[PDB]
Amino acid sequence: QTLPVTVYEMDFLADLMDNSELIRNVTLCGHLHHGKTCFVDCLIEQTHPEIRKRYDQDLCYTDILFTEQERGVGIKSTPVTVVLPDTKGKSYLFNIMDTPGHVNFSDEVTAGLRISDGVVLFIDAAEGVMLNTERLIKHAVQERLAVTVCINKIDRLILELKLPPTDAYYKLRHIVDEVNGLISMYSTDENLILSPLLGNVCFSSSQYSICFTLGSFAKIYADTFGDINYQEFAKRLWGDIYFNPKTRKFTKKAPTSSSQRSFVEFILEPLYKILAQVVGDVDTSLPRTLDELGIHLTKEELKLNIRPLLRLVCKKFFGEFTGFVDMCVQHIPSPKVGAKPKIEHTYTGGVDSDLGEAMSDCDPDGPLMCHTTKMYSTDDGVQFHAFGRVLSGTIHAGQPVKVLGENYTLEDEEDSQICTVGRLWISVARYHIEVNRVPAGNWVLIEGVDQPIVKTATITEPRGNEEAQIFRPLKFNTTSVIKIAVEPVNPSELPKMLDGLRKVNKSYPSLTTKVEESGEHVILGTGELYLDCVMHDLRKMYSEIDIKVADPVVTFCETVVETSSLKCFAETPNKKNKITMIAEPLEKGLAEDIENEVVQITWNRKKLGEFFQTKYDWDLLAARSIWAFGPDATGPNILVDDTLPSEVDKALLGSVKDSIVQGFQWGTREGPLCDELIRNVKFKILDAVVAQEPLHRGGGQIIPTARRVVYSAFLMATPRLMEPYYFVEVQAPADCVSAVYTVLARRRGHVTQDAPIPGSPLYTIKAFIPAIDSFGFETDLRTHTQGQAFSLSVFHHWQIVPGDPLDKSIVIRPLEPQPAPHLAREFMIKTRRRKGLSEDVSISKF
Amino acid sequence: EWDASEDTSIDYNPLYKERHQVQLLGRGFIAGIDLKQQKREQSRFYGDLMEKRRTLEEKEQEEARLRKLRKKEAKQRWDRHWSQKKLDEM
Amino acid sequence: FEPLDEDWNEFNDINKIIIRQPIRTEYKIAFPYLYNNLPHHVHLTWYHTPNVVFIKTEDPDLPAFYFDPLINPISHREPLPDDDEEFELPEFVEPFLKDTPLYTDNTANGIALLWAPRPFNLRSGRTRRALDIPLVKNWYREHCPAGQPVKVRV
Numbered sequence A: 001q002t003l004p005v006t007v008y009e010m011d012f013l014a015d016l017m018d019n020s021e022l023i024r025n026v027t028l029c030g031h032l033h034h035g036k037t038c039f040v041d042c043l044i045e046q047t048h049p050e051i052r053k054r055y056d057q058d059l060c061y062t063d064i065l066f067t068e069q070e071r072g073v074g075i076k077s078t079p080v081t082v083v084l085p086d087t088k089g090k091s092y093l094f095n096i097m098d099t100p101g102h103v104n105f106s107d108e109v110t111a112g113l114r115i116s117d118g119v120v121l122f123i124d125a126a127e128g129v130m131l132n133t134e135r136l137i138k139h140a141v142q143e144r145l146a147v148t149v150c151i152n153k154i155d156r157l158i159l160e161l162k163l164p165p166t167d168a169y170y171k172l173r174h175i176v177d178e179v180n181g182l183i184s185m186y187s188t189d190e191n192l193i194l195s196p197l198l199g200n201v202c203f204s205s206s207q208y209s210i211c212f213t214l215g216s217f218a219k220i221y222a223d224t225f226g227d228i229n230y231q232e233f234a235k236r237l238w239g240d241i242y243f244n245p246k247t248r249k250f251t252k253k254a255p256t257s258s259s260q261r262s263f264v265e266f267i268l269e270p271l272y273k274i275l276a277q278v279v280g281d282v283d284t285s286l287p288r289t290l291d292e293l294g295i296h297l298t299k300e301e302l303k304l305n306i307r308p309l310l311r312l313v314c315k316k317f318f319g320e321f322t323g324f325v326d327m328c329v330q331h332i333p334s335p336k337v338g339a340k341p342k343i344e345h346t347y348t349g350g351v352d353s354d355l356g357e358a359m360s361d362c363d364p365d366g367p368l369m370c371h372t373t374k375m376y377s378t379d380d381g382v383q384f385h386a387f388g389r390v391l392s393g394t395i396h397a398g399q400p401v402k403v404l405g406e407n408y409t410l411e412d413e414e415d416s417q418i419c420t421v422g423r424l425w426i427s428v429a430r431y432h433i434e435v436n437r438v439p440a441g442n443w444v445l446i447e448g449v450d451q452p453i454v455k456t457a458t459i460t461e462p463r464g465n466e467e468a469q470i471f472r473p474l475k476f477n478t479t480s481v482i483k484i485a486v487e488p489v490n491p492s493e494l495p496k497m498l499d500g501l502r503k504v505n506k507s508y509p510s511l512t513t514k515v516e517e518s519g520e521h522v523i524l525g526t527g528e529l530y531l532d533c534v535m536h537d538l539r540k541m542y543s544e545i546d547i548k549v550a551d552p553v554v555t556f557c558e559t560v561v562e563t564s565s566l567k568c569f570a571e572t573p574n575k576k577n578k579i580t581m582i583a584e585p586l587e588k589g590l591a592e593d594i595e596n597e598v599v600q601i602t603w604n605r606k607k608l609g610e611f612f613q614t615k616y617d618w619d620l621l622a623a624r625s626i627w628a629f630g631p632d633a634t635g636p637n638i639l640v641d642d643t644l645p646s647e648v649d650k651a652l653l654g655s656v657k658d659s660i661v662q663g664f665q666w667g668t669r670e671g672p673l674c675d676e677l678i679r680n681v682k683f684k685i686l687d688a689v690v691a692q693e694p695l696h697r698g699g700g701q702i703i704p705t706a707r708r709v710v711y712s713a714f715l716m717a718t719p720r721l722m723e724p725y726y727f728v729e730v731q732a733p734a735d736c737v738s739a740v741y742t743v744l745a746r747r748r749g750h751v752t753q754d755a756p757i758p759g760s761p762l763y764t765i766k767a768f769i770p771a772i773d774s775f776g777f778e779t780d781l782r783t784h785t786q787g788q789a790f791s792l793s794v795f796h797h798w799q800i801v802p803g804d805p806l807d808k809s810i811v812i813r814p815l816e817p818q819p820a821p822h823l824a825r826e827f828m829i830k831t832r833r834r835k836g837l838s839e840d841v842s843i844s845k846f
Numbered sequence B: 001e002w003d004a005s006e007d008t009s010i011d012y013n014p015l016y017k018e019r020h021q022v023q024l025l026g027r028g029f030i031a032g033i034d035l036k037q038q039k040r041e042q043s044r045f046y047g048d049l050m051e052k053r054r055t056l057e058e059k060e061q062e063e064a065r066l067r068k069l070r071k072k073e074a075k076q077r078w079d080r081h082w083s084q085k086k087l088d089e090m
Numbered sequence C: 001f002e003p004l005d006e007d008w009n010e011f012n013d014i015n016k017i018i019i020r021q022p023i024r025t026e027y028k029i030a031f032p033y034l035y036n037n038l039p040h041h042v043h044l045t046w047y048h049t050p051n052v053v054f055i056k057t058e059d060p061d062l063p064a065f066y067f068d069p070l071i072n073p074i075s076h077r078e079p080l081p082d083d084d085e086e087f088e089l090p091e092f093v094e095p096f097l098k099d100t101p102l103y104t105d106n107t108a109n110g111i112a113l114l115w116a117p118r119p120f121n122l123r124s125g126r127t128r129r130a131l132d133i134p135l136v137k138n139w140y141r142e143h144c145p146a147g148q149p150v151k152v153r154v
């Protein structure tokens, strides 16, 4: 096959994959537009001689979509496989995943962190820590990966702010201290202290090809002057340490009052002087500076403009990017060493099983275990390619494989299929290298298994490997709340759209497509630009037809506030057995403790009940007697047995509990108000008259009966609705902040925090907004503030809608924004009208 | 002439009639419109931020720079109208 | 511009639509595929550029690199080894470019020309014939100033 010219032979990359110690699986991430794809462009320019940046435009070598070019933002996470040298000269194999930094594509990072071991967080030196950086530190700690931080855009400390040197050092120290604080907030490990002395923090500027740690610039000193232990010299270039020119030593006390720090004196001021002599003094004193530093240029190279000449001078000076390689090797484990917490975290069935011990060593032969998370489309869009990593064994082209889905269990054996591998590639950004075998520890692109794959898949052997279980599904960082409804324009072309509706369900990890009972096709999303990309990809790549889209709405939920006035009893239609229930709301903060896995089922009753009676001061009787949580084992509800073994024989009650939990878990989804999920409610079992004969204890009698019991207990205890609230961070100049306060005044919001950015003339506004009011919010700010203020919004929480959703005395005029007491009634009636229920529900319905 | 019915931006929005134009750190200027008139029509907010955050010697530095600018303006004007000038200097 | 009648369905039911805030045309233009029926020949606009934080210099007697107090003040407060393990550099070891000063007279002007419009950010190019240089294009390209009459806006 044909390939571009590369500084290393491809047979070297083919032979280097067989050693699992010389590989690093690294995910680059960060906030929106802090220099990820440009750093990847610099790495591609380092590895390829024939690929160079244009003089006026950014390259974006790993931005291959047309939407990514027209919008100017990253959309899909893209892999690349390169070979890079370190400082000492040893070649290493890197699998680098570029994830998009926008918040609504945070699901593209979670699919990237499932198949990697280390995180490289890019932070803008001018803006500092922002919203998505704070979210990705949490999402990288909770997924148990090692974290390194690279500070990009330091030239903005030079050419834009024009900042004094020790103040820029103070800015960098404040950024690193904020990183250490956000690490120490979430991590339980006290050995995660980030400092540039440990080789853990690297400094960079992506636009002019600058990348250095302390060790690489000490290596530059050792290559310039000679006879210097650079690894010892790099241990004293950060912190309050001073060079004393009398004794030629590094002392912590001040030699003079005007003595600069060592990082300012040796590292930062030569960078200032290089940029100053290139930018300001190109005509008079630039040849003396370039003759002192040892860099020679052509006369045709000296006639360029200021920016390509500065990029060329910094590229000839700093050279290859060895400090990034040193950091990603020192602080990110190999896939042989770091396999054990990956198997402990992601493999269902535990690491203590037989297959977990086999996958814990990264054995390149034996049981073939692969885990595919990403699905890529072709140029034609008629078929997909799977993309994952090889946990164990060696995958081969033409080998029959067994695809296992997310619904597979050893008991069922339903979600499984036998397929044939067509081709195998290793992925570079704009081309793919075809191979015939991939060993363990690498990333792999598989052709011919795309048909049973929906979100993720597990590849095993057909014969043998009988105790293979699937890996965990992707636990996303947010919950999609935006509902949109779609229809085709021509109703005869409905099976065409239903093709594309199951194709964009494969390439998008957090997308949720469903069909309502009224026949409406509902797509769930997290924001406006996300569903914009959904519609673009859907139409232009999978439909080629016109599709009508409705007005977007948010997803509502159901709750209670008060305790029900009367005991709710109901019998089965066999008229032998009766269930009675009182419904109450939960305490403040327990819902989130269930959602964040602080409280869990399957514990052996001790520690579980002990948590309830220790923290929330629950009665010991209740604390021992919890049967179930929410619609999921992790959902924010509780079911409490409040029978007594003296009042009803609990030995007979313990046989019907298995049907009552099915009743509860099928009755807590699609509640009686507008067929939605309940939040924040506990259900408490009073009188139960249990049938004696086994044929009267059937589930078909009692599960809709317990469903009706839950519904009656919910309707009696003053039911209310809940809406999602977004967290909003606004980056604005010093006068537009009052305009932001003016704009947020009409969308039922409130501003919580207004904080000045240290080291920058911008402010940050942190506020909450209703998600139903957040349609067109960004356009309102960027139009009213002349495009200066910018804002991003993520899902934060749920709160109760004001108003009564059961007040039939309230009349609703159509086509009018209603005030605050009319809100819950309007929302409830319009959602019932949309989903296709009756125009009202009564108190005595169930 | 162009008719008034061809006009756009006739929108009854509180956000769009008062579009809240920028002044750009009290340093940027709209081109062509008179610079003294632009310094008169400013919000007069960033001047307070200056006189709060400048150094105590920098108020004297700002006053000395304004005195040098007024000296340059007095050297420039020394282009009056003939109703306030004499005969030997005309 | 000149242009380049729908029945009541189950889909456009206004009893299903929550009218909370009025949807405008710039919402359709910024996001062309979310709120539009039949979006035929739209073009995808640019999303966002990072905020250029370049601050202009008003006094030539100030140094070129100076803490201009529009910038907010930084609030003030590691494995440091001991002084006893004495590391000593050779005598000819110096920091880079210590003979050159930090800033010259052409430094601030060189930084200010980096953010100049076209062609003032250049230093080399070709000539253009004099009738191909519009001098008014930015003025009606930017926006309308406030307080202008009707016919000037038209």
Ligand SMILES: Nc1nc2c(ncn2[C@@H]2O[C@H](COP(=O)(O)OP(=O)(O)OP(=O)(O)O)[C@@H](O)[C@H]2O)c(=O)[nH]1
Residues within 6 Å of the ligand: A031, A032, A033, A034, A035, A036, A037, A038, A039, A058, A072, A073, A074, A075, A099, A100, A101, A102, A152, A153, A154, A155, A156, A204, A205, A206, A207, A208, C050
């Ligand atoms: N001043 C300066 N600008 C930079 C630097 N690196 C990148 N930029 C610019 O910032 C803008 C965004 O860079 P990208 O690399 O596209 O940002 P990004 O991180 O890929 O954004 P995502 O798509 O979220 O990944 C471009 O105009 C870059 O040229 C840098 O070192 N200095």
Ligand SMILES: [Mg+2]
Residues within 6 Å of the ligand: A033, A036, A037, A073, A074, A100, A101
């Ligand atoms: Mg990017």
